[PDB]
Amino acid sequence: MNVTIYDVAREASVSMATVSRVVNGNPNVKPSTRKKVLETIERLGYRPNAVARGLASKKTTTVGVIIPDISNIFYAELARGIEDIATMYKYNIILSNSDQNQDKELHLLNNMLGKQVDGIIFMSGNVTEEHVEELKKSPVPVVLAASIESTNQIPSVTIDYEQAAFDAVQSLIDSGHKNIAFVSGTLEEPINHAKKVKGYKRALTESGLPVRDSYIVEGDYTYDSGIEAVEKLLEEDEKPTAIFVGTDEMALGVIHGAQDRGLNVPNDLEIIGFDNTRLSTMVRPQLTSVVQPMYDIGAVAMRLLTKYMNKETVDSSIVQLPHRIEFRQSTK
Amino acid sequence: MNVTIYDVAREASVSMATVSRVVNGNPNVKPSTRKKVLETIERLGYRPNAVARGLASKKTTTVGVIIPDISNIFYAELARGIEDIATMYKYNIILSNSDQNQDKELHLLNNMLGKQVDGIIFMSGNVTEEHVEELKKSPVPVVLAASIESTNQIPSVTIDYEQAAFDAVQSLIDSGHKNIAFVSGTLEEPINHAKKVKGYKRALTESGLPVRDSYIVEGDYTYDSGIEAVEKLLEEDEKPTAIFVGTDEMALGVIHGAQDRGLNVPNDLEIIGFDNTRLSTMVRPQLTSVVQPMYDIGAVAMRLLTKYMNKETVDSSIVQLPHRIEFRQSTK
Amino acid sequence: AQKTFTVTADSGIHARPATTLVQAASKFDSDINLEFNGKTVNLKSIMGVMSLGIQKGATITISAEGSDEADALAALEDTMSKEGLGE
Amino acid sequence: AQKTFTVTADSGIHARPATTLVQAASKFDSDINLEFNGKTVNLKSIMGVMSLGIQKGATITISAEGSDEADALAALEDTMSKEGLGE
DNA sequence: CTGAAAGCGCTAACAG
DNA sequence: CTGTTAGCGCTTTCAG
């Protein structure tokens, strides 16, 4: 434990500039004299100090990650995605929950940089103009993962929530649907307003079915917003023939409330979701959804950050990742 | 460059020791100076590097936390209650997934330790014998969370799994159940063989309603396994009027399972899960599940650990947070 | 100095809601106390509150004793309802 | 040096499966690259692999070439099998 | 209260 | 290959 590097320099009877080498598999050191020292090392119980080194070498081999909430499956999988990769590349990570609130993100980003990180993976649902003023000042590489960025000024990783919007709905147009509604999350959110509705919309105007502003019923992302969004859409008027939901947990509500009034999901109303989270199979008629690989985003995000931190010029700081449709049984 | 302790020393015209004492906000340094320094400080934009200070103080103000899988609902909540409190206590949390497998848990421990944590929230589904060995010889405090190990040699937080289960079965027994089975996670993991099955068993031999080792079918903790554990149990001579699932996801796979077979969960066979993650609500017959305070385990697992690091000592190193059930539609 | 609330929030005094009641009572110097079912706990200890297991419907008594009692009480009232736990 | 499989896992070459595969194929000196639907990428890169978008039922070809080339194949074949993504 | 060396353990130029 | 010489940026006994 306290047997410092110097303590070992004695057992091995070599300098410390030398154990420093053995410890890190340095450039040349006799196989006999290296396993000689590494030998008396384990003998003791010496444990290299990551803080002494951090200081002496200005690198910690730890990244800082700031996601809204590791409690919500979305981020957690994304987080898993990051961790496995940081580890794959011998990095420890520092996790902190911001909860999408403007101050903490900056506090954290400070404590982070203050805690001497080697890179930052930031993720939020609304990357304010200030954030970029902010994030661009950092002294280390920074990348967004599935995070809503505008000027494409700071490296990001994601899938075209716009195309994925279009592709998803199109599927529905191709089958004979003129009255297709759209449930979604907080309107004050880029992913929604910015790309979600955009895709949905152009989808129709592209087919010639301008859309009823009302046909964009929203709500907080829970299963609650589901039976909610349904009841409202239905009784209201026109009783759409198909729905589209901004996530999976909502799509579920969309499906039960539709079964509650009396409709048949596979038939009468065909619904379709986004994300395709575990729960996409955990429902009555399994929910056809638009695949968003949150694990690859995080995995990739961290990997990009890995190059930057190792100075390789791996350009295309804006990475897109294949999304896709998975029709299980929901949509005829 | 980036900015130093000595810098503030000039701009404030005080000694680096003065600057140190205000950043640390230690007692006594006249309001006259404590003030002067603090301006030189936020105007100059200083940020002290936690690494340099770690070396100096033997303290990093950050804890390691081995964890099975952060992607998993159960631990994701556990990891939020932790973080949540570690923040509350000005603590940063390093984190790496272990995958319940014995060798990683032991590599993380030294990577963590050498990184110099100040505490370690350890949590596994199977504490080993060699486990308590290296844990007892750790330099820094430690406590297990949503994890249990025999000898009680280590501080810890958890629930009464034996009672938690026994009460579930009981809820059924008293209702008119003689045949009730147990679909469970990996029997080779103590959480199952040690307290889950025991609870279940006794509950029966208690009311004198004996058990066929057959009724104890084993699945992994997957939604599918739940669909597989029901079809097997329905492929029994005298089918069980009730089942007890060691998870809610699993229980979700048992519910749909019976439905896709021909039984309507509430009547034909009542189903009671464990944990009470959001999922319970997302199912047709809302799933009645024993309740376990995930956030509370970590909340408490971490706060407790702050006591040990913060030298204060309070007695209850083996906390058992209460439980209860939540009867939804799934059963009486 | 104090008050009695009907904890009506589904999760009772648990999770994020709870971790806040325990934060807000820590911002005030006064001595804050919470009794429930006849046992008492420092409204400032996460390990104490969280270990009681207050369910929806329980009746709890938050009590302040000290210089700023009022600021806090007037404080653990707002939080209580802004976090919708009691009345 | 070469082998063709068909991912039969419902996630295809994604999440852990793909990292455990790359990783599994990142411990070999011999070169290795995965090809599919026209594109070919370094099977040693996490950015490359998760670019293809490989879904289930997709068909892929693993090609190794180097001093370890031989075992390189047995190794990834196993991991494809035991990780149950391709068979 | 407030300076003043004395380094925490390591690594990093640069010898040899 | 391997030593030797310096610090990295803070915090601390002690002193006055």
CATH architecture call of the largest domain in chain A: 3-Layer(aba) Sandwich
In one word, what is the shape of chain A? elongated
Secondary structure class of chain A reads alpha/beta
Give the second-level CATH assignment, the architecture of chain C: 2-Layer Sandwich
Total strand segments of chain C: 4
Q: How many structural domains does the protein architecture of chain A include? A: 3
InterPro entries (chains C, D): HPr (IPR050399), HPr-like (IPR000032), HPr-like_sf (IPR035895), PTS_HPr_His_P_site (IPR001020), PTS_HPr_Ser_P_site (IPR002114)
Modified residues (Phosphoserine) (chains C, D): 11, 45
Organism (chains C, D): Priestia megaterium (Bacillus megaterium)
Family (chains C, D): Belongs to the HPr family.
Detail the topology: elements first, then pairings.
The complex is a heterotetramer, with 2 copies of chain A (332 residues) and 2 copies of chain C (87 residues).
Chain A: H1 5-13, H2 16-23, H3 31-44, H4 50-57, E1 62-67, H5 73-88, E2 92-97, H6 102-114, E3 120-122, H7 129-135, E4 142-145, E5 156-158, H8 163-173, E6 182-184, H9 191-205, E7 216-218, H10 224-236, H11 248-261, E8 273-275, E9 289-291, H12 294-308, E10 318-320, E11 324-326
Parallel strand pairs in A: 1-2, 1-3, 3-4, 4-5, 5-10, 6-7, 8-9
Antiparallel strand pairs in A: 9-11
Helix pairs in contact in A: 1-2, 1-3, 5-12, 8-9, 10-11
Chain C: E1 2-6, H1 15-24, E2 31-36, E3 39-42, H2 46-49, E4 59-65, H3 69-73, H4 75-82
Antiparallel strand pairs in C: 1-4, 2-3, 2-4
Chain A binds a DNA duplex (16 and 16 nucleotides) through residues 4-6, 14-18, 20-21, 23-24, 27-30, 33, 48-49, 51-58.
Explain what this protein looks like in three dimensions:
It is classed as transcription/transport protein/dna. The entry lists the keywords protein-DNA complex, phospho-protein, transcription-transport protein-DNA COMPLEX. The assembly is hexameric. The entry is titled "crystal structure of transcriptional regulator-phosphoprotein-DNA complex". The complex is a heterotetramer, with two copies of chain A (332 residues) and two copies of chain C (87 residues). Chain A is an alpha/beta fold and 332 residues long. Chain A has three domains: 59 residues, 434 Repressor (Amino-terminal Domain) (Orthogonal Bundle), CATH 1.10.260.40; 129 residues, Response regulator (Rossmann fold), CATH 3.40.50.2300; 143 residues, Response regulator (Rossmann fold). Chain A is built from twelve helices and eleven strands. In chain A, the strands form three sheets. In chain A, strands 2-1-3-4-5-10 form a six-stranded parallel β-sheet, with helices on both faces. In chain A, helix 7 links the parallel strand 3 and strand 4. In chain A, helix 1 crosses helix 2, helix 5 packs parallel to helix 12 and helix 8 packs parallel to helix 9. The longest helix of chain A has 16 residues. Chain C is of the alpha+beta class. Helices cover 31% and strands 25% of the residues of chain C. Chain C has four helices and four strands; from the N terminus they run E-H-E-E-H-E-H-H. In chain C, strand 2 and strand 3 form a beta hairpin. Chain C is globular, with a radius of gyration of 11 Å. Strand 2 of chain A pairs antiparallel with strand 2 of chain B. Chain A binds a DNA duplex (16 and 16 nucleotides) through helix 2 and helix 4.
